[PDB]
């Protein structure tokens, strides 16, 4: 459970085991009883995600487990989609854009005639990814303000666009330029998770404040940094993925023609600059706009980011490190 | 210049020729001098779009030509992308998801390190689609509120997702179910155009009101209806597109195994139900929430929709009708 050497990060408290255990039992019931998420054989993979620790660690300010469950269901649904549609065996399914758009309608609803609406409605139960999105979004919409819901839909639209760029490149084994990879990884990104911190914390960042260019930069930087964290921790895992799975070290090595080690080390330095820039941008906004909802939201994003690093560091079931130090 | 027989629509006044002519000259200068939109050989296609009439007709309440130009630049950029990336010769480019995401960064900016940011910045001038988005969004961002800008980015994310579902299906000649086609056509949709009516009208629909579920349904229905208008007017044109280009009549005919004529006629009935549903949903919201910005926005969406039908009806350069009556 050691951190990537040289990776700039903040330690976090051990997550409340009582909350962890309650989330674990509730998410299991949701997955099995409400959305039929998986067949028996894939239960170990489910528990291996440690989503309870994940979310408790990422949302220390959640007033209740009900609040935590808003994020937990969405996290599990997000994984289910990426696992079932995107990582569909082979490099990338040619029909990904069609599958994702139809799944997207479970988040941003189809509106149509009396004839075609019911047929769409029925598609929402047709597979696990869509049952998962549909149910999870349902809970979110009931608890969050209309603005918080709209905000999440936009961030999900971003995520799906990110998936589709990754999938399009994989169809030809295209290795993008480093900045091009990073642009993709700005969208194919944890962003929809930290941005619901206010909903999960029981308050609202007003839409007009969310929309500020400086806030938008703060959010992008945070997502970018914490997403590269995944690149770093999952690097060894991905060397075994079908084809040549892209992550920052792999793209750096291939484009800049460096050895894997030097490319990985630079990738750590890239993460560090992103993380520091996020923190500086956050401090600047905290000062420029010291409204309580803004300050809470900024603190919650940082907590999510720190929690996300902690979850990656400790998840030895999913991840391990390269021998580069 | 006759309307599709049986198509429910509202007549509109002749657009102010003075405004039309001023938009025409300004958009030509933008296209040629600012963004180098096209080489000489494709000027006829440019003028053939009649974008001046289009926008004046669609935004009767614009206080100035500067306001009209906000929408006009974006319309022209939207076309340029769809023409240059999506209709790239052949059915659909395998790398579409990558090209669109990078173009999307001209709308929703990349945030990164000191090293990679400049390389991204340089990509914004690399082709006409990106010069067009970048410049047009630049003008929009200067004139609109941060919320109006965020709203447009979400609607552009929707549009690009729509492109990618269409492109993914085209890669295998997949004909979706009718409702599946309509779900795609809900995103691959004029929506980003009528939704900027308030910006172009010099006022703001507040974000919290935009976010209301009833408003979201009103917007989706309006976009859905006015987008099927295009299916109907461009049907004959598309019979000549590479492969089998999908539109509502073609999908209805293929899935429900009907002759082209009966499928087209049903497609008109589908349009009509969508249009009526939009109007009823709009009346319901006008009554439920009689705030001035809401009422103006609802009237502007309807004006855009009526204007969009008028532009299709009169554009005999681009469109013609089937002999089905
Ligand atoms: C939670 C969410 C919004 C999306 C899940 C996909 C995503 C954005 C990641 F960053 C997971 O990284 P990766 O796809 O590389 O998954 P890994 O196998 O390394 O854990
Ligand atoms: C203006 C905008 C946001 C996007 C342009 C693409 C689009 C959504 C259309 F509806 C054009 O229809 P089509 O793609 O069938 O173009 P046609 O060739 O029939 O005129
Ligand atoms: Mg993935
Ligand atoms: Mg990874
Ligand atoms: Mg098109
Ligand atoms: Mg058409």
């Amino acid at each position: 459970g050691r951190a990537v050497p040289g990776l700039y990060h903040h330690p976090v408290p051990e997550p409340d085991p009582v909350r962890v255990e309650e989330v674990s039992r509730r998410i299991k019931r949701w997955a099995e009883d409400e959305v039929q998420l998986y067949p028996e054989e894939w239960e170990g993979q489910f528990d291996g995600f440690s989503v309870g620790r994940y979310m408790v660690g990422c949302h220390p300010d959640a007033p209740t487990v009900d609040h935590l469950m808003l994020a937990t269901r969405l996290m599990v649904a997000e994984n289910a989609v990426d696992d079932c549609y995107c990582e569909d065996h082979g490099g990338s399914p040619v029909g990904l854009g069609g599958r994702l758009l139809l799944a997207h309608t479970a988040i941003d609803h189809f509106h149509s005639t009396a004839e075609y609406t019911p047929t769409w409605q029925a598609s929402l139960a047709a597979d696990a990814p869509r049952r998962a999105y549909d149910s999870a979004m349902g809970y979110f919409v009931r608890a969050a303000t209309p603005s918080q819901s709209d905000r999440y839909r936009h961030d999900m639209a971003r995520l799906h666009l990110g998936y589709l760029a990754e999938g399009a490149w994989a169809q030809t084994g295209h290795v993008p330029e480093v900045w091009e990879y990073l642009a993709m990884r700005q969208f194919n990104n944890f962003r929809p998770c930290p941005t619901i911190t206010d909903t999960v914390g029981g308050y609202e960042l007003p839409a007009d404040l969310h929309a500020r260019p400086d806030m938008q930069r703060v959010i992008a930087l945070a997502g970018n940094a914490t997403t590269i964290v995944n690149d770093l921790y999952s690097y060894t895992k991905e060397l075994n993925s079908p084809g040549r799975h892209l992550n920052l070290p792999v793209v750096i090595a291939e484009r800049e023609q460096l050895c894997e080690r030097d490319a990985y080390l630079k990738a750590v330095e890239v993460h560090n600059e992103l993380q520091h820039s996020f923190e500086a941008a956050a401090a600047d906004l905290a000062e420029a706009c010291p409204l309580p909802p803004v300050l809470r939201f900024l603190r919650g994003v940082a907590a999510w980011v720190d929690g996300n690093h902690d979850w990656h560091r400790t998840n030895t079931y999913r991840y391990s490190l390269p021998d580069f130090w």
Side-chain angles (χ1 to χ4, degrees), chain A residues 17-274:
Chain A
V18 173
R19 283 199 161 181
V20 170
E21 192 45 47
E22 185 66 23
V23 169
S24 294
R25 61 179 57 98
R26 297 195 192 182
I27 198 66
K28 181 160 293 297
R29 298 274 48 81
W30 176 72
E32 295 182 355
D33 308 343
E34 300 187 54
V35 297
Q36 298 75 51
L37 192 73
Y38 55 78
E40 301 177 341
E41 320 82 73
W42 304 79
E43 191 176 5
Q45 282 205 6
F46 183 80
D47 306 337
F49 205 81
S50 299
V51 72
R53 260 187 85 89
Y54 205 167
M55 294 295 93
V56 171
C58 281
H59 294 281
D61 76 333
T64 64
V65 171
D66 274 334
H67 282 98
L68 283 170
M69 282 288 294
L70 296 175
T72 308
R73 296 193 200 82
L74 290 167
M75 168 68 67
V76 168
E78 287 145 5
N79 297 327
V81 162
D82 193 41
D83 286 356
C84 301
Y85 289 176
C86 294
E87 277 290 341
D88 184 325
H89 300 351
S92 175
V94 177
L96 185 55
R99 303 187 81 183
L100 279 181
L101 182 141
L102 300 176
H104 194 80
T105 67
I107 295 166
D108 195 11
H109 291 165
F110 183 50
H111 293 278
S112 199
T113 63
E115 178 182 356
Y116 300 115
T117 305
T119 324
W120 164 71
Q121 175 63 45
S123 78
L124 299 181
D127 57 18
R130 282 176 281 187
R131 295 191 295 271
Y133 273 175
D134 184 27
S135 169
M137 187 60 182
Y139 286 103
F140 189 86
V141 166
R142 282 188 50 86
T145 70
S147 287
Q148 289 169 329
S149 285
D150 188 51
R151 187 206 309 170
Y152 179 74
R153 297 184 185 103
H154 187 181
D155 285 319
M156 290 304 288
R158 284 184 175 102
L159 175 67
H160 295 149
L161 281 181
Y163 290 167
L164 293 165
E166 175 190 63
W169 291 338
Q171 281 171 241
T172 65
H174 177 76
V175 185
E177 287 300 279
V178 181
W179 74 266
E180 292 177 342
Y181 169 83
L182 288 169
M184 180 273 289
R185 203 62 165 136
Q186 171 166 310
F187 293 80
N188 177 359
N189 193 105
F190 285 114
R191 178 172 178 146
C193 304
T195 55
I196 69 178
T197 193
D198 58 323
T199 293
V200 173
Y203 65 100
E204 177 170 42
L205 175 69
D208 289 345
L209 298 175
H210 171 258
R212 289 166 59 110
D214 52 13
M215 181 60 87
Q216 288 302 295
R217 175 165 172 85
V218 168
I219 293 164
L221 288 174
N224 287 172
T226 199
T227 303
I228 297 312
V229 163
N230 174 273
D231 284 23
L232 297 167
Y233 284 89
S234 61
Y235 167 84
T236 57
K237 162 187 176 175
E238 279 155 14
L239 294 164
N240 299 318
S241 289
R244 164 159 54 193
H245 190 91
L246 307 182
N247 53 53
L248 187 60
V250 161
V251 173
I252 292 183
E254 211 283 324
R255 301 316 300 163
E256 306 183 6
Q257 296 280 276
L258 296 177
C259 64
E260 292 299 304
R261 178 180 186 275
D262 298 329
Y264 190 102
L265 292 180
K266 185 176 177 178
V268 175
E269 296 309 297
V270 171
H271 163 270
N272 290 175
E273 179 175 349
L274 292 174

